[PDB]
Amino acid sequence: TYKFVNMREPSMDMKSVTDRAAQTLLWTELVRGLGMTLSYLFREPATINYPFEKGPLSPRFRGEHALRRYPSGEERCIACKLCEAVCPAQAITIEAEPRADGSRRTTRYDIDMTKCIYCGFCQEACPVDAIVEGPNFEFSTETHEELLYNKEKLLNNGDKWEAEIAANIQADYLYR
Amino acid sequence: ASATRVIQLLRNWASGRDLQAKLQLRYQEISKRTQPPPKLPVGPSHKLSNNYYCTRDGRREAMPPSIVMSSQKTEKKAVTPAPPIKRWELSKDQPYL
Amino acid sequence: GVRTSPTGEKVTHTGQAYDDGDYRRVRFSDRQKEVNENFAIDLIAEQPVSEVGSRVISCDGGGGALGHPRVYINLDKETKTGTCGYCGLQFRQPHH
Amino acid sequence: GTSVKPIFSRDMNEAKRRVRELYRAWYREVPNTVHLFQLDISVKQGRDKVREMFMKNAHVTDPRVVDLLVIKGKMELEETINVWKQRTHIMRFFHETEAPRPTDFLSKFYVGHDP
Amino acid sequence: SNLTLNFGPQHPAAHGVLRLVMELSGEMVRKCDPHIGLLHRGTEKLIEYKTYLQALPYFDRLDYVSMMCNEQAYSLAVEKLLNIQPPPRAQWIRVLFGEITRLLNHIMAVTTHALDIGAMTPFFWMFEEREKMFEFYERVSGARMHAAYIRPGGVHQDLPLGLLDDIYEFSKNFSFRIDELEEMLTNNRIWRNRTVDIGVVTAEDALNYGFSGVMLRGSGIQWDLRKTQPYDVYDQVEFDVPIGSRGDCYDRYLCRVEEMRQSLRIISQCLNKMPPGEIKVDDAKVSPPKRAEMKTSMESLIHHFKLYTEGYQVPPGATYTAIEAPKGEFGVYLVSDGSSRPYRCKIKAPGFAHLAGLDKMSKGHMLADVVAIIGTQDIVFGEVDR
Amino acid sequence: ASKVKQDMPPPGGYGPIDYKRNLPRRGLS
Amino acid sequence: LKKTTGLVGLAVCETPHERLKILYTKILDVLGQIPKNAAYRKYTEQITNEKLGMVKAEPDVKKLEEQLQGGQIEEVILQAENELSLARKMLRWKPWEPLVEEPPANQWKWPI
Amino acid sequence: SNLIEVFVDGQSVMVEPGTTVLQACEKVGMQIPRFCYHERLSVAGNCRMCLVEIEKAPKVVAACAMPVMKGWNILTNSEKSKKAREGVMEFLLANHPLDCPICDQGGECDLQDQSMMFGSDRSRFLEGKRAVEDKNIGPLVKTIMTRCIQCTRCIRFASEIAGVDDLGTTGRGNDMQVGTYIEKMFMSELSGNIIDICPVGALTSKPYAFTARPWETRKTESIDVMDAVG
Amino acid sequence: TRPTIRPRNDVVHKQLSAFGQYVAEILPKYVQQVQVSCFNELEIFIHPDGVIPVLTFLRDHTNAQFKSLADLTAVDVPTRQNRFEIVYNLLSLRFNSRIRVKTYTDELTPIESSVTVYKAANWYEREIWDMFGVFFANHPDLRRILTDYGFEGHPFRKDFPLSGYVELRYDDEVKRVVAEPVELAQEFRKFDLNSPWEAFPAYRQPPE
Amino acid sequence: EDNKQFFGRHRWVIYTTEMNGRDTFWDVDGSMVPPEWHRWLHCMTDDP
Amino acid sequence: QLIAVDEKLDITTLTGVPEEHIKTRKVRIFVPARNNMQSGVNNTKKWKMEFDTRERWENPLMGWSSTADPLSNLVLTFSTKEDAVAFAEKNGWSFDVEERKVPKPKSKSYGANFSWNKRTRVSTK
Numbered sequence A: 001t002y003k004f005v006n007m008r009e010p011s012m013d014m015k016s017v018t019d020r021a022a023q024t025l026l027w028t029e030l031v032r033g034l035g036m037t038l039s040y041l042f043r044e045p046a047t048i049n050y051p052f053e054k055g056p057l058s059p060r061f062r063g064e065h066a067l068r069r070y071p072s073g074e075e076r077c078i079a080c081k082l083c084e085a086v087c088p089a090q091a092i093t094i095e096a097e098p099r100a101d102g103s104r105r106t107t108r109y110d111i112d113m114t115k116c117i118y119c120g121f122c123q124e125a126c127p128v129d130a131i132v133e134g135p136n137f138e139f140s141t142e143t144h145e146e147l148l149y150n151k152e153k154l155l156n157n158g159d160k161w162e163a164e165i166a167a168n169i170q171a172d173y174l175y176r
Numbered sequence B: 001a002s003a004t005r006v007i008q009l010l011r012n013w014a015s016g017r018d019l020q021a022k023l024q025l026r027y028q029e030i031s032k033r034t035q036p037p038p039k040l041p042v043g044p045s046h047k048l049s050n051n052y053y054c055t056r057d058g059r060r061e062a063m064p065p066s067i068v069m070s071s072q073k074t075e076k077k078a079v080t081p082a083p084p085i086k087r088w089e090l091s092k093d094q095p096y097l
Numbered sequence C: 001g002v003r004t005s006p007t008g009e010k011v012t013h014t015g016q017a018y019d020d021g022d023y024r025r026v027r028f029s030d031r032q033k034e035v036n037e038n039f040a041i042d043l044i045a046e047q048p049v050s051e052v053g054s055r056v057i058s059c060d061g062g063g064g065a066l067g068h069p070r071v072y073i074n075l076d077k078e079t080k081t082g083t084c085g086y087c088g089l090q091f092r093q094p095h096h
Numbered sequence D: 001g002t003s004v005k006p007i008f009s010r011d012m013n014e015a016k017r018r019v020r021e022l023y024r025a026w027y028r029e030v031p032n033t034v035h036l037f038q039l040d041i042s043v044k045q046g047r048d049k050v051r052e053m054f055m056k057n058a059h060v061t062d063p064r065v066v067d068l069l070v071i072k073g074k075m076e077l078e079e080t081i082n083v084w085k086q087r088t089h090i091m092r093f094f095h096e097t098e099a100p101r102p103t104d105f106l107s108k109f110y111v112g113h114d115p
Numbered sequence E: 001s002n003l004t005l006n007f008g009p010q011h012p013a014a015h016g017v018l019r020l021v022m023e024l025s026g027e028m029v030r031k032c033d034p035h036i037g038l039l040h041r042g043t044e045k046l047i048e049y050k051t052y053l054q055a056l057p058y059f060d061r062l063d064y065v066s067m068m069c070n071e072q073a074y075s076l077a078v079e080k081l082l083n084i085q086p087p088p089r090a091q092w093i094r095v096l097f098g099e100i101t102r103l104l105n106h107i108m109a110v111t112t113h114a115l116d117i118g119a120m121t122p123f124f125w126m127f128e129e130r131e132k133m134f135e136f137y138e139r140v141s142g143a144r145m146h147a148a149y150i151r152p153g154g155v156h157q158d159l160p161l162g163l164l165d166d167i168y169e170f171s172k173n174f175s176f177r178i179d180e181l182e183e184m185l186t187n188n189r190i191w192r193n194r195t196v197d198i199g200v201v202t203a204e205d206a207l208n209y210g211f212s213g214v215m216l217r218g219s220g221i222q223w224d225l226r227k228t229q230p231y232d233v234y235d236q237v238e239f240d241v242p243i244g245s246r247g248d249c250y251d252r253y254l255c256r257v258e259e260m261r262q263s264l265r266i267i268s269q270c271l272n273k274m275p276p277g278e279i280k281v282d283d284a285k286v287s288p289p290k291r292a293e294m295k296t297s298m299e300s301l302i303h304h305f306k307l308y309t310e311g312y313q314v315p316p317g318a319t320y321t322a323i324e325a326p327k328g329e330f331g332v333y334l335v336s337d338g339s340s341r342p343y344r345c346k347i348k349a350p351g352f353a354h355l356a357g358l359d360k361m362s363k364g365h366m367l368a369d370v371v372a373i374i375g376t377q378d379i380v381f382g383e384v385d386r
Numbered sequence F: 001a002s003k004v005k006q007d008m009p010p011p012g013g014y015g016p017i018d019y020k021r022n023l024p025r026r027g028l029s
Numbered sequence G: 001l002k003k004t005t006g007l008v009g010l011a012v013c014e015t016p017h018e019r020l021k022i023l024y025t026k027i028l029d030v031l032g033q034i035p036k037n038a039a040y041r042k043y044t045e046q047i048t049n050e051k052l053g054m055v056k057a058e059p060d061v062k063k064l065e066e067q068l069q070g071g072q073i074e075e076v077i078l079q080a081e082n083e084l085s086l087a088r089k090m091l092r093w094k095p096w097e098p099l100v101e102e103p104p105a106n107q108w109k110w111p112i
Numbered sequence H: 001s002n003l004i005e006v007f008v009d010g011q012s013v014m015v016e017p018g019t020t021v022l023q024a025c026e027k028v029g030m031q032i033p034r035f036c037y038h039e040r041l042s043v044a045g046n047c048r049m050c051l052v053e054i055e056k057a058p059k060v061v062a063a064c065a066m067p068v069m070k071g072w073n074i075l076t077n078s079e080k081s082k083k084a085r086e087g088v089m090e091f092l093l094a095n096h097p098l099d100c101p102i103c104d105q106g107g108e109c110d111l112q113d114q115s116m117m118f119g120s121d122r123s124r125f126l127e128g129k130r131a132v133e134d135k136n137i138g139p140l141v142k143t144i145m146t147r148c149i150q151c152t153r154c155i156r157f158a159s160e161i162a163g164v165d166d167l168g169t170t171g172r173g174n175d176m177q178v179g180t181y182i183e184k185m186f187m188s189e190l191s192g193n194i195i196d197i198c199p200v201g202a203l204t205s206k207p208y209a210f211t212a213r214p215w216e217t218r219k220t221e222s223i224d225v226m227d228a229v230g
Numbered sequence I: 001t002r003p004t005i006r007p008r009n010d011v012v013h014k015q016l017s018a019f020g021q022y023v024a025e026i027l028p029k030y031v032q033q034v035q036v037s038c039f040n041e042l043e044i045f046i047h048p049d050g051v052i053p054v055l056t057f058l059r060d061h062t063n064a065q066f067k068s069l070a071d072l073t074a075v076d077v078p079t080r081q082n083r084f085e086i087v088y089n090l091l092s093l094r095f096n097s098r099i100r101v102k103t104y105t106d107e108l109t110p111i112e113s114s115v116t117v118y119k120a121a122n123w124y125e126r127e128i129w130d131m132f133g134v135f136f137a138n139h140p141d142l143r144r145i146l147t148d149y150g151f152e153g154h155p156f157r158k159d160f161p162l163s164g165y166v167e168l169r170y171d172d173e174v175k176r177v178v179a180e181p182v183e184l185a186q187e188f189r190k191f192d193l194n195s196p197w198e199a200f201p202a203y204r205q206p207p208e
Numbered sequence J: 001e002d003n004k005q006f007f008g009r010h011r012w013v014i015y016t017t018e019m020n021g022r023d024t025f026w027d028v029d030g031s032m033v034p035p036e037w038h039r040w041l042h043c044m045t046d047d048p
Numbered sequence K: 001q002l003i004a005v006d007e008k009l010d011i012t013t014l015t016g017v018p019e020e021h022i023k024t025r026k027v028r029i030f031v032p033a034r035n036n037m038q039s040g041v042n043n044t045k046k047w048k049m050e051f052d053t054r055e056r057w058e059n060p061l062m063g064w065s066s067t068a069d070p071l072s073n074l075v076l077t078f079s080t081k082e083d084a085v086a087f088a089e090k091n092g093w094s095f096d097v098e099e100r101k102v103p104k105p106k107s108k109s110y111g112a113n114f115s116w117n118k119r120t121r122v123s124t125k
């Protein structure tokens, strides 16, 4: 089922022809466009006062990565390497060994944030909610090297953002 | 909208429309940023019996394509790849723009 | 459980520190070496061993579905405690 | 028999004639390329390089492969004449920023493992 | 001798990566030769080293103005190769977000086309609506454009509570923004002078040149893949197909505006007909189990582990699956060798053929006319170069 | 033991949504 | 009588019945030079004779369009022209002949 | 000669007397799922994963142990065979621990792979799982016996190949445990092979523990120089 | 086999099989094989010499009317003596149908260009020549379309490496962008994903 | 907070004039917001 | 009409491969051995072509593994050994071919577990 967009005909009575002539000579549709812009001029603008005001975001928003802990302070990550396997950009590099107490823990956990596509597949794949995409998005740098995160950087990010990260996870985890 | 009434009238006249009815900026009408928890039901395969996987395995019902007329190996009416497409009907809602 | 090297460089929890003759230390000049101060091994060492009255205990890391996969831990051995392979929490049957 | 379909040439003589046509076209074009792209090389350098590129494939004895090589050379010439290539593309033939790689056994032994 | 000109890549009307070698006589365009590949990233080869899930995000970045539509095309191809069916609620969500995506794309196309022509203001009015639409994307997936929301088997997550009401609130107001855009452009005599009888293409030439979508329907061809070859639940929604009569820029612009209105209609129907149920296929050898199941039951953990490390195997075979994307027919030729990684993935983009037709369409026109024709073809070079 | 809770349309459906063209005549002779 | 076909570049044909009769007659004349047992000849003659009889049986253009299932008699004329050109090309090509060669042993084997 | 004719899904196969159903199936390139069977160990027949239907035979047979009879038509992919495989896999996974992320076997685990290929995709086991204590058998073979599926492969290897009778089973029923019953080291010049034959992560390499996953490793086929055996 | 499994369409399967038999009967000189897949897609495998006569037929015959060329691509299969599979996907709007035409070639054998049949083929053939090295005879303007000027090799071949052979950087001594042999700070990590257990018994090959 | 403003202007922050070591009278940026007020300010929640 | 060439196939000048990566490479053509950790045999069906392993080193930043040979991840699959040999020959690569290893058929007897007078008698089940 379809419709035509440009298949109409103008009436040739003297009234319609004279109206068309008046439009041609007195520029009525141009005045209509001017009226539309004038109407927009007196409307309230949509600009927010950044950085004092921010755009709305969801609990599901994918931001800067972080490594999380159990409430006892133990790392959640147990070096299963599912995030490394699933990562579509090969942005994750993991090395692991038994710890001094025999625990399964990483010795290297690197994310190349200039390789990362911020898809969130790593946090979907993680079985223990160890690696997450946090809410932070304002982490621009002056050098390329600062965006090659090692494990200490990611643990610091987790320690710094856990209060927000836990609340967002509490908000979203019943959909996962 | 905090616009005064005379500016509102001027906006309506310039636009030719009732602008206050449909405001682009969004206020209190939008949904709250805090919501109750969901429950999210489960699918048809969440059963304790009569649920053997071999009866619901789509991947294993795929098979190699049917071979018609290998080269190695009357009446005969002509055929088309499908019946001819039926002509479209003009819209009852709005036939012409 | 942070600790310093003979060069003054902080040693991380992975035990990685640049040697005294390593040129790569130059990368920290006029800057700093990022080190996480909350060592997980020491933090889990401070948790007390839970006394439970069953031969098999269940652990999911707390928080239900917000924890780790639920595993079962045998506590028959009296010479050692039962440790969770995900969380590090320890369990034992009452003795003595 | 070998039942092979040609591309342009039936034997090696017509393929060699097409090679000579392409070589003449490149040789004529070189001075214009030097002028238009504002290169710091001489016309002799460019022609010597053209000769070198042609000599690289002197060992080919298959007329179809020769025809395809002539097709590729014609494509490169058309890219050059229309200034679709830039100066970087033209200068890529000279490898002016690659260090000279040793060829004798001893230097390769000193520098690494590659045979 | 004609004058030769580089139109782009660093040009406002060249879309960043298009270098057009133009032969001109004065400002008359004697010849157009588009040079592309300035955004060729080797997507089709990269996909050969990914699992199907790993390959999914590459489709977000082909036509970056219509993300979920690309996701849907790829998901439909993979689901056809897997011989599985997405659940009904997933199909309704897919159609709803596909129409939201069509709204986004048509806003971008119409307003950037107007900006090339010289009308800069409607871009600003409509990009706030695009912003609101972006929020719907981010609320459903956590990303404003590259959602990766639509996957083979259904969708990644269910809608958050309250999303449908906000989509309804936006949809009940978008028609007035369309009305304002049409008040600025549709009857303006300058706009008509810039668009009427520019880039006229015949129906036969459009078919032979591989055109699709509006580039067909502007020339009177009554064809729409949603009507003729429906997918998901498109055979359950009512809408009209806008049809042009002149095959020029003005009729194509009118068609796109009417397609926006019909998309609003479809979105209303989708909002009122959303059913309950699960949102991905209840087959853990294809779709991952829920996180609570993964942490409780052995089979769920095994299937999570395997689907996120190896990925599902796809039975061997090849399919060409096409959809009515906002820019025309978007297709995938997917060849599976039986393993968990695709053997070959050829991507068919409508803009490829449309831009190949640009020299034919520009015959007898000027420079500004060529700018208008580029705008009217609705070209994004992520899908052209892949 | 609570009821299934999902994002769904309100009973009786949503309010009607306008989509058609609206360009009033709005002029003299 | 009809104002426009609605398709850009397709003109309205006056006297479509005579044009169709001419085109179908020319197609049958060309097909008469193709071997009698060639499948192309018999199939195309069958469909062409069906269309020619249908054209001769209905003098109303709209009802002829409805019967022919061909979409707007001008496109029927265009399709007849395409079929005539194809018939000449087929007479040149002679594809009714036996397959030129058998592919290699595993040319089409998939997977691998 | 002395061969007899059997059928695999209707396809004729000539086999020598004493050929088992599993071997006849692999004559036509069909691999029957297995846990306890190993072609270099004695037949056990305890895992029951190889159960397969014989045409016109009411009861399925253990393909690893059953000699094939003349005229038998083995139905490797019938409904009976698939349902038997699903039931056995369900029984194997009922008490298995949710250890895959921390288990070194993950990614090269026959239990995982045969669950994905021949088992169902979900669980309906609603009880608690059994947990057993670990046995110390040396510094080479790490033992986590909650993952043990009681295949008896390690026992048969130790007895038959290594000539060491130190492994066995203690208890019975659900409480049956594989071990040594005393604190004893299984130190043999061939001990490490029990890591490879063990289908699950119950026996793993201690020096290798936690270091790598199977999919990231590159394989170089080479020769050993530690002795003159090559 | 209910909600999870994709439904079948016997009507379309039968119609496509009948039309494939029709095409094979009309053009025995070139048609080598006809197949209908279980998701209702028709494939016609032809000798290369028949690229033009077949396509033209499918475009111009009154009962075919495949007026649209949706896509034209190549597939590289190094184990085959004829390396490259050439695939044409055609759409008929009159009959609301799709068809696929397949042929083969090796590195040194030209394929006839189909620009006289479908103009849309032009760029597609260029892309094939760019990505696979297949030469199309009588192409109006055959040259690279996707790769950089002066680029050597055909990237979409299976034996072409993923990162190629050369990379680019700006050099200040010569004040220009230069190409040098590729060196990667991190090598792409090859993953071995295939399970050693067979997935689909319906596609098992004879054990030779 | 001012809920009478439209969504996006209904919440805002006045930054401190002195953070950890630096003078922020003129130099402010969004990274100065601590995580809890980051959640409130971006409307990921309705509760301060 | 055809042209009847009589020379062996050689496409090296057309592939765009650098000289060094033609004459200095050694490809191995082989059927990959079964991974000893699993009993599945589905990864031992096809022939593989791979290249010789070149140097990998440590990146001074991040300690990542760095390479300089572009063929370190190139593996081709072939149906037979002859197809792989032909492909290697037409590309000018020197090759080493290893013959396919098939496990020999074995005599399995369950009853032998309980022999009256043989050593095959088992002491446990």
Ligand code: SF4
Pocket: A083, A086, A087, A088, A089, A090, A091, A092, A111, A115, A116, A117, A118, A119, A120, A121, A122, A123
């Ligand atoms: S977000 Fe995606 S690309 Fe980034 S590390 Fe996670 S999986 Fe890799």
Ligand code: SF4
Pocket: A076, A077, A078, A079, A080, A081, A082, A083, A084, A094, A122, A125, A126, A127, A128, A129, A130, A131, H101
């Ligand atoms: S972050 Fe999660 S997925 Fe990645 S290795 Fe650690 S536990 Fe595994």
Ligand code: SF4
Pocket: E302, H096, H097, H098, H099, H100, H103, H104, H105, H106, H107, H109, H110, H111, H112, H147, H199, H200, H201, H202
């Ligand atoms: S043995 Fe296999 S199934 Fe069991 S935990 Fe280890 S990897 Fe998982």
Ligand code: SF4
Pocket: H147, H148, H149, H150, H151, H152, H153, H154, H155, H178, H197, H198, H199, H200, H202, H203
């Ligand atoms: S440890 Fe391994 S080989 Fe030994 S009984 Fe358990 S599963 Fe079988």
Ligand code: FES
Pocket: H033, H034, H035, H036, H037, H044, H045, H046, H047, H048, H049, H050, H051, H062, H063, H064, H065
């Ligand atoms: S393999 Fe036969 S019973 Fe275990």
Ligand SMILES: [Mg+2]
Pocket: H105, H194, H195, H196, H197, H198, H199, H200, H201, H202, H203, H204
């Ligand atoms: Mg083991």
Ligand SMILES: [Zn+2]
Pocket: C059, C060, C061, C068, C084, C085, C086, C087, C088, C089
């Ligand atoms: Zn725990």
